[PDB]
Structures are given as structure tokens and as C-alpha cells.
Amino acid sequence: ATLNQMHRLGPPKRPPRKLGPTEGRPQLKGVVLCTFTRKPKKPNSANRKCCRVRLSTGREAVCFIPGEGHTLQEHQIVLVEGGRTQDLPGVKLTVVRGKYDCGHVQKK
Amino acid sequence: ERGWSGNSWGGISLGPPDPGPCGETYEDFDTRILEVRNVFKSIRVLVAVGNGKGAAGFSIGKATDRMDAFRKAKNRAVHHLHYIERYEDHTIFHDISLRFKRTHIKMKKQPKGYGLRCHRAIITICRLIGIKDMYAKVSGSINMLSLTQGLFRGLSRQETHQQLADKKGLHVVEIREECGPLPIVVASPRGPLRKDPEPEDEVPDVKLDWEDVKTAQGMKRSVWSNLKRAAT
Amino acid sequence: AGSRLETVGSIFSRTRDLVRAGVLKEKPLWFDVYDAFPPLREPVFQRPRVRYGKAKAPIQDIWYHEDRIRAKFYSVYGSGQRAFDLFNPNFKSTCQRFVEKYTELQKLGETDEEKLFVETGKALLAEGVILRR
Amino acid sequence: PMKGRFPIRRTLQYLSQGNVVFKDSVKVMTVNYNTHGELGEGARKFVFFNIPQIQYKNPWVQIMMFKNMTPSPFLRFYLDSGEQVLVDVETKSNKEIMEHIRKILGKNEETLREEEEEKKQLSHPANFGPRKYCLRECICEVEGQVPCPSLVPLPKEMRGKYKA
RNA sequence: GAUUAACCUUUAGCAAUAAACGAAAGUUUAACUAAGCUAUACUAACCCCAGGGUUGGUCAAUUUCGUGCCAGCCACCGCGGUCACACGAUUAACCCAAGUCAAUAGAAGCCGGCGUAAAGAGUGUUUUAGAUCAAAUAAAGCUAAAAAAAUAGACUACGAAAGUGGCUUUAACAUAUCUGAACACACAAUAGCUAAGACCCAAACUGGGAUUAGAUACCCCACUAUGCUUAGCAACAGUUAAAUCAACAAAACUGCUCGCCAGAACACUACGAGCCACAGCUUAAAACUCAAA
Numbered sequence: 001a002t003l004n005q006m007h008r009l010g011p012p013k014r015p016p017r018k019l020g021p022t023e024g025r026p027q028l029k030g031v032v033l034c035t036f037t038r039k040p041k042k043p044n045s046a047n048r049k050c051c052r053v054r055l056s057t058g059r060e061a062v063c064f065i066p067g068e069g070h071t072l073q074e075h076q077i078v079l080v081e082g083g084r085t086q087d088l089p090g091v092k093l094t095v096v097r098g099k100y101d102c103g104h105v106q107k108k
Numbered sequence: 109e110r111g112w113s114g115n116s117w118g119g120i121s122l123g124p125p126d127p128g129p130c131g132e133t134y135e136d137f138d139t140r141i142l143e144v145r146n147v148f149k150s151i152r153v154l155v156a157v158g159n160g161k162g163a164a165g166f167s168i169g170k171a172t173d174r175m176d177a178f179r180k181a182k183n184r185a186v187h188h189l190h191y192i193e194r195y196e197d198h199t200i201f202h203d204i205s206l207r208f209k210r211t212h213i214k215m216k217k218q219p220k221g222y223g224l225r226c227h228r229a230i231i232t233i234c235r236l237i238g239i240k241d242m243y244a245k246v247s248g249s250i251n252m253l254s255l256t257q258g259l260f261r262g263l264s265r266q267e268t269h270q271q272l273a274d275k276k277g278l279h280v281v282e283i284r285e286e287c288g289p290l291p292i293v294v295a296s297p298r299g300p301l302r303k304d305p306e307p308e309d310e311v312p313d314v315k316l317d318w319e320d321v322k323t324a325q326g327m328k329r330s331v332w333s334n335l336k337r338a339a340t
Numbered sequence: 341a342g343s344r345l346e347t348v349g350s351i352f353s354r355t356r357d358l359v360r361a362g363v364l365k366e367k368p369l370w371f372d373v374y375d376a377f378p379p380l381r382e383p384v385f386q387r388p389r390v391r392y393g394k395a396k397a398p399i400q401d402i403w404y405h406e407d408r409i410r411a412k413f414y415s416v417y418g419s420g421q422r423a424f425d426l427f428n429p430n431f432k433s434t435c436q437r438f439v440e441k442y443t444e445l446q447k448l449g450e451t452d453e454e455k456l457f458v459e460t461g462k463a464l465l466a467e468g469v470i471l472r473r
Numbered sequence: 474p475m476k477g478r479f480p481i482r483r484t485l486q487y488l489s490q491g492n493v494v495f496k497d498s499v500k501v502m503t504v505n506y507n508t509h510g511e512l513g514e515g516a517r518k519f520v521f522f523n524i525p526q527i528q529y530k531n532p533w534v535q536i537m538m539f540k541n542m543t544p545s546p547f548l549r550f551y552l553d554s555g556e557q558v559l560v561d562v563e564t565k566s567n568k569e570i571m572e573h574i575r576k577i578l579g580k581n582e583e584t585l586r587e588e589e590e591e592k593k594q595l596s597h598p599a600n601f602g603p604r605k606y607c608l609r610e611c612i613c614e615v616e617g618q619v620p621c622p623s624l625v626p627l628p629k630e631m632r633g634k635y636k637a
Numbered sequence: 638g639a640u641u642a643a644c645c646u647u648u649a650g651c652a653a654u655a656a657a658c659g660a661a662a663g664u665u666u667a668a669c670u671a672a673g674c675u676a677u678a679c680u681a682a683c684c685c686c687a688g689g690g691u692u693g694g695u696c697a698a699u700u701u702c703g704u705g706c707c708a709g710c711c712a713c714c715g716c717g718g719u720c721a722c723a724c725g726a727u728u729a730a731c732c733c734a735a736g737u738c739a740a741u742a743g744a745a746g747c748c749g750g751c752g753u754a755a756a757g758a759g760u761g762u763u764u765u766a767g768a769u770c771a772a773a774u775a776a777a778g779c780u781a782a783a784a785a786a787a788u789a790g791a792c793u794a795c796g797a798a799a800g801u802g803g804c805u806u807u808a809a810c811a812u813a814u815c816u817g818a819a820c821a822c823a824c825a826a827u828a829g830c831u832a833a834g835a836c837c838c839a840a841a842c843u844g845g846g847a848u849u850a851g852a853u854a855c856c857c858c859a860c861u862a863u864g865c866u867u868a869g870c871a872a873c874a875g876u877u878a879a880a881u882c883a884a885c886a887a888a889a890c891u892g893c894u895c896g897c898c899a900g901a902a903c904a905c906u907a908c909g910a911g912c913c914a915c916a917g918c919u920u921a922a923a924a925c926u927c928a929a930a
């Protein structure tokens with residue numbers, strides 16, 4: 001572009017950043033509505049442990065439960081952080097282990 | 109010792125070139141690997157050689173075995189040597205802006221002690237040549253072969269102070285801020301000296317880079333510029 | 341051995357640089373001779389370009405004044421029936437005799453091209469040179 | 474690279490090279506110049522190279538340009554008193570025009586040096602305050618004085634926790 | 638208290654400074670001063686006292702077992718199917734260290750481009766400003782071979798483009814700088830409708846005839862809409878000097894101006910607006926998704 005065009009258009013206007021599933025917050029508290037398993041997209045095969053949770057914002061979202069073995073039940077309180085599960089499409093929230101009802105993974 | 113990374117061939121030394129069929133020895137030359145690539149199997153290797161005193165070269169070698177490719181590249185490199193002029197045997201004579209294919213290289217002459225703040229491959233090649241103080245910025249496509257070719261081309265096409273003095277028939281006088289207003293004559297014409305002064309261009313019509321002007325005015329804000337780094 | 345980059349510098353500059361750099365132990369046998377008696381131009385590779393736009397080659401066309409006279413002669417009396425002998429360094433064609441006689445008239449009289457032509461023809465016929473129109 | 478011919482004109486260092494600082498009387502400068510003619514060449518250069526510098530050094534002076542309205546280039550300066558100053562600029566280079574206007578309507582170096590000395594008094598070196606305004610934040614930065622407790626703990630006798 | 642991922646003591650004194658008041662000694666102050674709590678941070682330690690993460694590549698650093706596309710793991714690329722340096726345990730090593738580093742949010746963004754990747758193919762005129770580059774067409778007639786015009790034309794002319802090639806005549810082919818309209822005015826080509834009219838021939842559709850074994854979709858006959866005639870709805874100016882130059886296209890570049898473009902798809906889309914109006918055209922998003930395209 002010419003100098004006149006750059007002057008008229010002015011400085012570049014970077015679009016506002018997109019808010020993620022946590023809405024720009026480190027973590028979010030949530031209530032477990034139901035627990036289930038989902039299958040990965042297929043270069044990989046597994047039964048990933050997931051749970052549907054109603055967040056403190058009121059939105060219902062699917063979260064992944066990391067680690068080997070969980071004891072989450074309905075009506076239990078969990079803390080969910082960001083971070084996509086690369087295998088599961090549409091799952092962008094992860095339950096924090098060792099906070100509220102979700103306990104740390106049992107040794108071995 | 110490792111190269112640019114733990115698992116990377118680049119930057120690794122291959123030792124001196126083998127004594128040539130012409131009968132010359134090259135014990136004062138060091139070889140460095142710049143790139144290794146699988147050709148679909150064979151291996152293509154780009155290596156550079158240099159004695160640290162201005163004589164340096166590079167070559168490609170293709171072979172089924174890696175060591176054969178290394179040997180071929182090294183031996184062919186020693187027979188295609190550039191001589192690179194160095195100002196005071198530590199830096200380049202002037203700033204060099206070049207574009208080889210889609211790779212752009214800006215090189216800046218620097219004072220003593222500045223070090224090599226350059227692309228890692230450029231650091232390797234400069235160490236082979238004997239340049240110790242220089243700044244370099246690589247833009248466009250970062251293609252290793254094009255980078256090497258452009259670097260050698262620009263460094264081989266630099267005009268020395270004596271060349272400029274002979275061309276313009278005038279004294280090349282150096283001004284150093286650390287030396288005050290003292291005029292240092294670095295080169296004088298070998299032939300006769302022109303008695304008419306150079307035109308005092310009130311405003312030269314030079315092509316400026318927005319990068320340099322932006323840095324000079326303080327409008328550069330990059331969090332990655334001027335970071336502390338190991339000695340190079 | 342020297343550098344095989346024939347497109348970078350010249351054989352002289354490459355040899356000199358590699359000698360000073362210590363790569364070459366001894367100068368080649370021709371180096372001193374080249375240094376003492378260099379060529380007029382340093383033999384550096386250059387790629388020949390094509391001329392576009394209003395760029396014309398600087399070669400001129402070789403014309404002389406007498407060419408005009410020659411043209412008229414070759415248009416009026418035609419090519420002489422006697423043949424040209426280009427091996428003889430001092431060959432004198434009929435047209436050349438006409439040219440010299442015309443020049444003598446011009447330097448010994450006025451400047452009227454048609455009058456000079458006809459008077460030259462008359463004098464050549466007087467000397468005994470056949471000239472058919 | 475930087476766009477346009479002579480991109481050095483669009484650098485702050487060049488813009489600060491200007492040596493004409495108008496006296497406070499000058500309010501408006503009009504520059505009438507011609508686009509063609511050798512005798513106006515310098516005036517054209519004056520518009521190309523020096524008007525940016527003059528405007529940079531004199532931000533509150535109104536500079537306006539006019540093209541091909543008269544046979545001859547000229548400058549006119551309007552003063553606060555109501556006076557007008559006419560400067561003919563045929564046959565004059567841009568440097569000559571700059572020197573002429575500097576001489577007739579420019580502040581001299583003595584007045585500028587006086588202004589800088591006045592500016593110096595505003596920043597008294599003895600004051601203590603933020604780095605934006607003062608050399609030192611606190612007296613504890615002065616050697617021989619008691620330093621910060623943040624960097625050197627005070628003895629117990631000088632702390633209230635051990636006095637109460 | 639409630640709520641949020643977010644969580645300091647229901648301390649002391651007016652001794653200093655500040656404020657209020659007083660003529661003043663002085664009096665008052667949850668301002669403030671001095672303390673309490675908290676790895677949030679900085680500084681300095683430490684007599685014993687170290688943890689957290691990481692170890693396939695990017696990127697410093699794995700031994701032995703267990704499991705077998707399961708359990709699980711990853712920031713990106715990816716690992717896991719009986720020899721897994723990538724999962725779990727264990728050993729060792731690596732980085733930082735009273736911290737470590739999982740999540741979140743900032744810090745750092747266009748002087749680059751527009752034939753083939755996103756981005757410059759209807760034409761002309763005006764336009765506030767910026768720059769320095771100051772054989773056309775229309776209308777009348779007429780016509781030879783057989784309504785549209787052999788030769789000329791192996792010509793390359795006229796016009797802004799679309800286009801213009803029989804002959805005669807009458808009008809007649811803007812502009813002394815350049816750039817600069819979706820929105821103004823003219824043209825242009827594109828097929829289809831509205832009133833009428835003509836109808837030799839042809840012919841979408843609609844009927845009828847003949848045909849294999851889902852006949853011929855295809856052949857034959859007839860006749861509609863229609864074919865016809867009116868009346869209407871990148872530009873400009875320079876250079877060949879340089880190293881020519883990703884590739885292929887069409888040899889490269891400069892100056893100046895306008896328009897347009899910033900990963901894919903959503904999307905020649907939705908909504909809004911304008912224009913029309915059976916079909917619509919112009920401008921033109923967002924959410925979700927992906928590591929590519």
C-alpha cells in the first residue's frame with residue numbers, strides 16, 4: 001500500500017482475542033451431572049473418561065478426567081482448568097486432580 | 109560435543125579435510141556440517157570448510173552412506189574456496205544487504221567485542237571464515253542452502269577501503285567516537301589524488317530499512333531482541 | 341590446488357588470495373609473468389545481456405564523403421564491366437578513378453554536384469575510359 | 474525498504490536537524506512556488522526537504538503552500554503585530570533560503586541557549602522523587618547515610634518492634 | 638455473610654509527620670506511625686535441613702520390569718498391537734530451587750504483497766484532492782451477383798469498449814499534463830417478460846405413428862412458446878543499468894497514484910441496508926471445527 005493509504009487506514013487493528021472455554025479464567029468450579037466415556041478420533045483407540053459438568057457460569061460442558069481411575073459421581077464438586085484433549089474433538093476442559101471431590105490418583 | 113541441538117547434525121565438526129590428490133595438506137582447515145537430508149535412500153549433506161583466516165568454502169555431497177557423503181562434500185569444498193576480506197581481521201568492511209532467491213540477509217559491521225549475533229549457521233560459517241564481530245538478520249524463507257549461497261556471495265562481493273580509495277581517488281578517513289575528532293586515514297589512493305572534493309550531498313537518496321530506523325527511534329518493542337546469550 | 345570457482349574473480353585474484361591465505365604453498369609458474377605484464381582487462385566472468393528499450397549498440401557505420409559519389413556512379417554508369425582485383429593492395433577501379441577526378445574538380449573549382457558529375461564524365465572519356473550509361 | 478524517494482526525510486533525526494526556530498511573532502508562513510522552471514528549482518527543493526523540518530521545529534506556526542499562482546516563487550510571513558515579510562526566492566538554493574529566513578526571523582543561538590538554561594533550572598538535582606522527575610528517590614541512596622531496611626536490616630535499637 | 642479460581646488482625650499509640658481548633662501551654666484523629674497474618678515479590682542467610690517438574694524430536698537428561706491400540710500419555714509433531722528410551726512402577730540422569738510450574742492473561746505484529754497461493758479483465762467522462770509524468774457513428778436513398786455484401790483484403794484501418802468491410806449524399810469522429818465514482822451520466826453484451834402485429838420455414842413443450850422384450854432419448858407426422866417486426870420497461874511516466882531470475886507463466890526492474898488482500902472451511906452464506914420484484918442482484922459476518930489449506 002502507498003503512504004497515503006497507510007495513513008488513511010491507520011495503524012493495524014488486531015481483532016480482540018477469543019475467549020476460551022474458561023472465559024479467560026485460570027480455573028472454574030463445576031458440578032458433575034453425569035460420567036461417561038468417549039472414543040478418540042481414529043489414528044488412536046481408547047475409552048477416554050469424561051464427565052459433563054455445569055460450570056459456575058451456568059454453561060454445561062464436557063471435561064476429561066486425567067489419570068488412571070476416578071471416583072467422580074453425580075452432584076460432586078470439581079475444579080476444571082483449560083487445556084485441550086488432543087484425541088477428543090470438542091473436549092477443551094480438564095478436571096483438576098486432588099481438588100474438592102476429585103482425589104489424587106491412587107498409587108499404582 | 110553436540111551441534112545446534114542434541115539430536116542435530118548441524119554445527120558438528122568433521123575434522124580437517126583429507127590430503128588432496130594434488131598433494132596439498134589442509135591441517136589448518138576445520139569442517140562443519142550445515143545440513144543432512146534423506147533423499148528418497150541416499151543422504152545429501154551440506155558442509156562448510158575454513159581455515160579461520162579468510163579462506164572458506166562450502167559443498168554438497170550425495171552418497172548412500174553418510175560418511176561417504178561427508179568425505180565427498182569436504183573434499184569438493186576445499187577445491188572451491190572463496191577468499192573473504194576482513195576489516196582488521198575481525199569484521200566485514202561495510203553493511204551488506206542481499207537477497208538470494210527468497211532468502212534476505214542483512215549484515216552489519218560492528219566494533220570489536222560485539223560478537224556474533226547471527227543465525228546459528230551464519231555463526232558457524234563466520235567462525236570458519238574468521239569474522240568475530242558482526243550482526244545478521246535473515247528474513248524470508250530460511251532455506252539452508254540458499255542462506256549459505258547468499259552469505260558467501262555477499263561476503264565475497266564486499267569492497268575494501270583500498271578499493272574505494274582507488275576508485276574514488278580520495279583518502280578514506282575513519283572517525284571513531286572513542287578516538288575523539290582525530291582523523292584516522294585507513295586507505296589512500298595508490299595513484300594520484302583528486303583535488304576536487306566529493307559533492308556534499310545535502311540529503312542522500314539512499315534506500316533505508318524500516319527495521320533499522322524503527323530500532324534507532326526506539327519504537328522497536330520486541331521481547332526477543334537484545335536477549336542475554338552465551339558467548340559466540 | 342587453486343579454487344575452481346571460475347565465476348568469482350579471475351585466475352589472478354583467486355591465485356593471489358589463496359597464496360596470501362597460505363592455501364597454496366608456492367605461486368604458479370605464470371603468476372610472476374602476469375604480475376609483471378598484466379592484461380588490459382582483468383578476465384572476470386560476465387553474463388552477456390540483451391538490450392531492450394532504447395538501448396542501442398554503440399557501433400557506428402563506416403561512411404565516407406566519396407561514398408555518395410560512388411553511389412551515383414554505380415547508379416548511372418552501373419558496375420564496371422572490368423572486374424575487381426581485391427588481392428592487389430593498390431587496385432584502382434573505374435569508380436575510384438571517377439571519385440579521384442571528381443575530388444580534383446571540386447578542389448580546383450566550384451561545388452555543383454551535377455556539373456561536377458558531367459565534367460568528370462567528360463574528362464574520363466577524354467582520358468580514354470569507356471563509360472556506358 | 475522505506476517507501477518513497479528520500480525516505481531519510483521521514484526520520485526523526487532528519488526532522489530534528491532543522492536549524493530554524495521562528496521568533497514568537499511569526500504566526501503564518503505561506504510558500505508560493507512553481508512546479509516548472511529552473512529559476513524556481515531551489516524553492517521546489519525548499520518545499521521538498523525543509524518545510525518538514527521547519528514545521529517540526531515550529532509546531533504552532535501555520536504553514537500553507539500554493540502552486541502555480543504567480544510567475545515567481547516567494548515566501549510570506551505574517552507576524553502577530555500584523556506585519557508581513559516578503560522573501561523572494563528566485564535563483565536561490567534551498568540552503569540559501571533557509572539561511573535567509575534563519576537570519577531575518579530565526580532565534581539566535583544565544584536565545585536558544587538561554588531557553589535551555591531556563592529549562593535546566595526546573596530539574597533541581599537536589600530534589601528527591603520518582604525517576605521520571607528526579608535523580609534519586611531517597612536520601613538512603615546517598616553513601617554515608619542510613620540505607621534502606623529493605624537492603625540492610627536496621628539494628629534492633631532503631632526498630633519500634635523492639636522499643637515497644 | 639453471600640458469591641468467586643481469587644479469602645490479612647473485630648492490634649497499640651497520638652512519641653514523629655500531616656490535618657482541625659486554640660493567643661498559648663496543648664487537645665483530637667482507624668490519616669498516619671509502630672506492630673499482627675500471607676512464599677505474591679525483592680534482599681541477605683542458613684548449625685543439620687529439598688522439593689517440583691522433566692528425560693522420543695523441537696529441548697538438557699533413562700535402567701529393569703509391568704501392560705499389549707488396553708490402561709494411559711502429549712505445547713506441536715505424535716506414542717501404546719510381546720525388544721515401549723514416549724503409558725504405570727523402579728533406577729539413573731537433567732533443569733530450576735524454598736520453591737517448582739499446570740491453567741489463565743498480558744508483554745512482542747503488517748513500510749509485506751495482489752498471473753498461477755488471499756488479493757488488479759466490461760468501456761468512457763466528470764469528481765474534493767494528490768503527483769511532477771504538465772471497414773467509426775447516425776439518417777436517407779440506391780444496388781450486382783445470387784434478406785446480407787464474392788474479388789479488392791497477401792490490406793490492418795476506424796472506434797472508449799462492444800464492434801465496424803456493397804455504392805451515393807448529408808451531418809460527423811471530445812479534451813494541451815497525469816492519477817483519482819459501488820454511490821452521477823452515458824454506452825455495452827447477456828437472455829427473458831409487457832402491449833400489439835406478421836407467420837413461408839424451423840422448432841423447446843403437447844399429442845399421434847413405428848419399433849426391444851424397461852423398444853430409438855435418437856426415426857416419421859402435426860402444431861405451440863420462440864426465432865421475425867415495431868412500442869417499452871491496474872492506470873500513467875521513465876530504464877536496460879545492475880546480481881536476470883524460488884518454479885512455471887509473459888525478459889527484468891524503478892518512480893507515482895488508486896483499488897484490494899492478511900490460514901482453511903463456515904460463506905458467490907445468514908442478518909442488516911439498497912435496488913428491484915415470478916427465478917432475484919450488490920455489500921457481506923459470527924458461533925462451532927481443524928493443523929493445516
Ligand code: FES
Pocket residue numbers: 610611612613614620621622623
Ligand atoms: S527508598 Fe529510601 S529508605 Fe528505602
Ligand SMILES: [K+]
Pocket residue numbers: 651
Ligand atoms: K502525633
Ligand SMILES: [Mg+2]
Pocket residue numbers: 114115
Ligand atoms: Mg538430547
Ligand SMILES: [Mg+2]
Pocket residue numbers: 643
Ligand atoms: Mg490473592
Ligand SMILES: [Mg+2]
Pocket residue numbers: 645
Ligand atoms: Mg494489612
Ligand SMILES: [Mg+2]
Pocket residue numbers: none
Ligand atoms: Mg485509639
Ligand SMILES: [Mg+2]
Pocket residue numbers: none
Ligand atoms: Mg505493616
Ligand SMILES: [Mg+2]
Pocket residue numbers: 724
Ligand atoms: Mg514412562
Ligand SMILES: [Mg+2]
Pocket residue numbers: none
Ligand atoms: Mg486467487
Ligand SMILES: [Mg+2]
Pocket residue numbers: none
Ligand atoms: Mg483521469
Ligand SMILES: [Mg+2]
Pocket residue numbers: 871872895
Ligand atoms: Mg485505476
Ligand SMILES: [Mg+2]
Pocket residue numbers: none
Ligand atoms: Mg446473496
Ligand SMILES: [Mg+2]
Pocket residue numbers: 908909
Ligand atoms: Mg448484520
